Ligand binder design. Structure first.
Ligand SMILES: c1ccc(Oc2ccc(-c3onc4ccc(-c5nnn[nH]5)cc34)cc2)cc1
Length: 237
């Protein structure tokens, strides 16, 4: 992810088949002649899409030009949460499934995984960062506190941002409960709140494993429901 001062990010296509798949996902969703109500509604929850981009002198080098969801914030606190019970897709080999489940074997049970967070701390004028090992360390016993950490500015728990996050996740959940045409594997929610009131972003990102489907995305729904439940309990802290 490359942050451009113009309020966009450039995401380099991942190697095939992942990068091509994410390009086609955005292309399908933001298709100029799309009148599909499901896809039109979904746009609200994605980064705005500015199409494929490549450097003027390097047509080989493929990027997606996307809205920087953090741009409107002064001191954005950012958390990326992978959603779902399975982070492998319907066409994964046995080896690939094993690889994916071993990365975080609690995915089925919890239905989400914190990929990272960056939290602004007021009293130190500084950022705490947590990497992928943080979330992969969390268990059923420690997931609530693990998530809570995102909402601590070093003096209060930001229950405003927690409540706002629930409210925005609920809208995404409502979208999922009103579509049976896409299933999303190893995709994420990006949470952003203002670390310097109740202003928040929650957006869907990372679409290298989105597939056509005939069914509700039950794993994604489970993940959202559990994440909402965890956030709800944090409101009682
Ligand atoms: C943990 C916490 C925060 C971190 O920093 C940032 C900063 C900005 C973004 C960020 O802001 N708008 C985005 C649109 C699409 C994506 C994206 N799409 N696919 N993979 N990433 C990331 C975006 C994402 C992450 C990095 C790690």
């Amino acid at each position: 992810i490359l942050q451009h001062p113009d309020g966009t990010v450039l995401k380099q296509l991942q190697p095939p088949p992942r990068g091509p798949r994410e390009l086609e996902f955005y292309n399908m969703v933001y298709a100029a002649d799309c009148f599909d109500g499901v896809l039109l509604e979904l746009r609200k929850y994605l980064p705005k899409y500015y199409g494929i981009w490549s450097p003027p002198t390097a047509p080989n080098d493929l990027y997606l030009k996307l809205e920087d969801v953090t741009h409107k914030f002064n001191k954005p606190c950012i958390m990326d949460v992978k959603i779902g019970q399975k982070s492998y897709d319907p066409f994964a080999s046995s080896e690939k499934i094993q690889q994916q489940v071993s990365k975080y074997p609690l995915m089925e049970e919890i239905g989400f995984l914190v990929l990272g967070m960056r939290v602004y701390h007021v009293h130190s004028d500084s950022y705490e960062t947590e990497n992928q090992h943080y979330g992969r360390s969390l268990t059923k016993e420690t997931i609530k506190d693990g998530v809570s950490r995102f909402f601590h500015n070093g003096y209060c728990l930001r229950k405003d941002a927690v409540a706002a996050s629930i409210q925005k996740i609920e809208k995404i959940l409502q979208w999922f409960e009103n579509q049976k045409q896409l299933n999303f594997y190893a995709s994420s929610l990006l949470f952003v709140y203002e670390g310097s009131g109740g202003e928040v972003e929650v957006r869907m990102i990372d679409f290298a494993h989105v597939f056509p489907s005939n069914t509700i995305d039950e794993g994604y729904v489970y993940g959202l429901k559990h994440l909402i439940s965890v956030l709800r309990s944090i409101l009682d802290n």
